[PDB]
Amino acid sequence: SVGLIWAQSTSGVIGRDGGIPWRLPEDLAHFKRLTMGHTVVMGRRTWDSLPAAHRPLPGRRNVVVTRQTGLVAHGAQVVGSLEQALCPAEPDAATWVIGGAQIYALALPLANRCEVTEVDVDLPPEDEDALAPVLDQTWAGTSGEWLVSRSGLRYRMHSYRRL
Ligand SMILES: NC(=O)c1ccc[n+]([C@@H]2O[C@H](COP(=O)([O-])OP(=O)(O)OC[C@H]3O[C@@H](n4cnc5c(N)ncnc54)[C@H](OP(=O)(O)O)[C@@H]3O)[C@@H](O)[C@H]2O)c1
Ligand SMILES: Nc1nc(N)c2c(n1)CN(C(=O)COc1ccccc1N1CCC(C(=O)O)CC1)C2
């Protein structure tokens, strides 16, 4: 059972300049509470984006997807494909794919659930932005209320499952 979790602007941006182009503390906490104790699978660029205090993500089995044989990621397991990341030698009840855009595109066909935070932030996309996957008619979801962060941004959480 594979889930994706991401935060996006309404416009669909998830990444810019090697990070996330908004600050939303309530969603960071939501991410931490949903993923704690589970396996988290990420692309190498997202692994490289994690700040030092969060690399590896504490309390989770970190799995990093790269084509670089010989890459060592201290505190994480390095695999050569997303299929490899989803065929662990020791199974986990819950596996969360935590980005980024390249890995989400690879994982979406294999996933049954998406947990999406929508951030009402005006972010005209730029050439090198990382963008969210698009959910087609094979996905249906439920939406929480629009909430306002202590920082001022409107946000809301969506929970999608494969039909
Ligand atoms: N808002 C959010 O929820 C969220 C979540 C996660 C990340 N982000 C942001 O998204 C950005 C990073 O995303 P990204 O799309 O640039 O990169 P990414 O998906 O995290 O990683 C891309 C890397 O994955 C590896 N890879 C891709 N396809 C592969 C395949 N088929 N087999 C093996 N390895 C494969 C490659 O590593 P090698 O080059 O090493 O071969 C590739 O360079 C950052 O700005 C980050 O902060 C945002
Ligand atoms: N895939 C996915 N989905 C989401 N909904 C969210 C995310 N990523 C990331 N989010 C944020 O708001 C932003 O995060 C961070 C941003 C900048 C620096 C550190 C962090 N974090 C510190 C604590 C770390 C941990 O210990 O987990 C995680 C990263 C929500």
**Contacts of 55 by beta carbon, 8 Å cutoff, 6+ apart:** 47, 75
Which ligand ends up closest to the CA of 35?
A: 2
CB 61 within 8 A of CB 40: yes
With H, G, I as helix, E, B as strand and everything else as coil, classify residue 105.
Answer: helix
Tell the residue number behind the tokens 């094979």, with chain if given: 138
The DSSP H or E segment spanning 34 is helix 25-35
Resolution in A: 1.6
Burial of 32 (0-12, 13-18, 19+ CB in 10 A): middle
Which residues form the pocket of ligand 2, taking CB atoms under 6 Å from any ligand atom?
Answer: 5-7, 19-20, 24, 27-28, 31-32, 51, 54, 57, 98-99, 117
How far is ligand 1, taken at its centre, from the CA of residue 89, in Å? Answer: 23
Which ligand has the shortest distance to the CA of 20? 1
